[PDB]
Amino acid sequence: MFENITAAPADPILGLADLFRADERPGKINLGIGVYKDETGKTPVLTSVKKAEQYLLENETTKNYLGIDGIPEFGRCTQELLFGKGSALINDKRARTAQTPGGTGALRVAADFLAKNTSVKRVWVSNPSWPNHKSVFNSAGLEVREYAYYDAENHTLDFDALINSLNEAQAGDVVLFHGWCHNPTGIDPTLEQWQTLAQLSVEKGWLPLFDFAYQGFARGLEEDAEGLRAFAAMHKELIVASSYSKNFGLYNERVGACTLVAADSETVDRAFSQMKAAIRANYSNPPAHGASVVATILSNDALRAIWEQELTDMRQRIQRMRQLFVNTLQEKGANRDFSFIIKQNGMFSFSGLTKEQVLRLREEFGVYAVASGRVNVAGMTPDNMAPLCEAIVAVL
């Protein structure tokens, strides 16, 4: 039965992590996958997280199955983070959230749900976008169409191209928007731009789907949620696939959420019963550990104060590395002006390196970046900045 199965191509992000592993070179540098590193080049378990974990170790009395949708408190805390504490969506009971295995799990559950319960056949994704978006949607059997976004020449969000590209989107299509800290460009719309978009979707009949994986990495928790909140106020319906992998440094515990919003309580509960059926036919119910760590921290004021500071430290450290990167490139003779990278948000900077330069960097210098030229600024430290900047100016 398997004789003719052809090998799948390596994952552009995750397979990169393998090559780097197998690399016996001493000075190799990561920069590929979106995982935070501290000053020492390590990815430690957050202190608020370690504390919540002892708490769970001393307090859990059972590992009995959670319901299909997970821990209720987790769901509530998630909605408050997303929409705000006194949100009308929350007060009118217009939103239901299911705990899922990571943000990817949330996107797939959203896809399966839409493919099986609505008339959706098309999902619009930005050019460029997280490479795995296409795979997830194609998996549920939906086609992916792409909308213009990035202006490679000016390193700006080409807004008119974005709008004119979206005019080919029909009423009933799904349009995918990144929350804030666009992966891979780091270029995001202004609040004014988010409002224009919110009113155009409403007028055009698009169903917004937000992939929110970096809440807290641009300006703050509540600020980073402004685009989505702009949208939540206008729309009767929307879905949010959020992730706690990055903002809680909980990557491998698989903590995410799929939030479904409908015009009313009655409709959303009915639509949610089908979302639950899609989950049962997939992984049954979600993994408790990571999600209970998140609920514990968000529900406890002392633990929450510690986590918020840890997140602030991650954010600030990345901001410092960005400046450090553009300066060092300059003082190493990387003649090209890389100042636009200071203008990007989040863990990543879209460097503008070509497929071949990205390839040479690795084979000749052992510094690993995604083939699209996307580099993980959070993977940079004061110690690896110079060898890294030295490799870059040499392939330029």
Ligand X SMILES: *Cc1c(COP(=O)(O)O)cnc(C)c1O
Q: Are 370 and 16 in contact (CB under 8 A)?
A: yes
- Say if residue 254 carries a ligand binding annotation: no
Distance, in Å, from the CA atom of 302 to the CA atom of 177, rounded to the nearest integer, reads 33
- Pick the catalytic residue: 124, 194, 206, 246? 246
Pick the closer one to a second copy by CB: 231 or 365.
231
Told to judge if 355 belongs to the known catalytic residues of this protein, a careful annotator would answer no
213 touches, from ligand X, a second copy, none (C-beta below 5 to 8 Å by class): ligand X
- The residue from 267, 319, 357, 372 that contacts a second copy (CB under 8 A) is 267
- The residue from 32, 34, 75, 249 that contacts ligand X (CB under 6 A) is 34
Told to judge if 211 belongs to the known catalytic residues of this protein, a careful annotator would answer yes
- Say if residue 183 carries a ligand binding annotation: yes
Give, as ranges, the residues between 151 and 190 that touch a second copy (CB under 8 A): 172
- Pick the catalytic residue: 51, 112, 130, 194? 130
First and final C-alpha spacing in the chain = 48
DSSP states along 268-288: HHHHHHHHHHHHHTTTSS--H
Q: Is 35 in the site for a second copy (CB under 8 A)?
A: yes
Phi and psi at 311, nearest 5°, equal: -70, -40
Pick the closer one to a second copy by CB: 254 or 317.
254
- Say if residue 130 carries a ligand binding annotation: yes
In our burial notation (b when 16+ CB lie closer than 10 A, e otherwise), range 53-86 reads bebeeeeeeeeeebebbbbeebbebbbebbbeee
Structure tokens belonging to residue 154: 């000016």
- Say if residue 34 carries a ligand binding annotation: yes
130 touches, from ligand X, a second copy, none (C-beta below 5 to 8 Å by class): ligand X
Helical spans, DSSP H, in the chain: 16-21, 47-59, 72-83, 88-91, 102-117, 132-139, 159-166, 191-204, 226-234, 265-280, 288-299, 301-331, 355-365, 385-395
Q: Is 213 in the site for ligand X (CB under 6 A)?
A: yes
Distance, in Å, from the CA atom of 273 to the CA atom of 209, rounded to the nearest integer, reads 19
Q: Is 188 in the site for ligand X (CB under 6 A)?
A: no
In eight-state DSSP terms, residue 218 is S
Distance, in Å, from the CA atom of 149 to the CA atom of 146, rounded to the nearest integer, reads 9
Structure tokens belonging to residue 262: 């409908």
How many chain residues touch a second copy (CB under 8 A)?
79
Distance, in Å, from the CA atom of 78 to the CA atom of 65, rounded to the nearest integer, reads 21
Give, as ranges, the residues between 214 and 273 that touch ligand X (CB under 6 A): 243, 245, 256
- Pick the catalytic residue: 180, 211, 224, 307? 211
Distance of CA 218 to the CA centre of its chain: 13
307 touches, from a second copy, ligand X, none (C-beta below 5 to 8 Å by class): none
How many chain residues touch ligand X (CB under 6 A)?
13
Q: Is 136 in the site for a second copy (CB under 8 A)?
A: yes
Give, as ranges, the residues between 89 and 118 that touch ligand X (CB under 6 A): 102-104
Summarize as ranges the residues that interact with ligand X (CB under 6 A).
Answer: 34, 102-104, 130, 178, 183, 211, 213, 243, 245, 256, 284
Q: List binding-site positions for L-aspartate.
A: 34, 130, 183, 374
By annotation, the residues acting in catalysis are 130, 211, 246
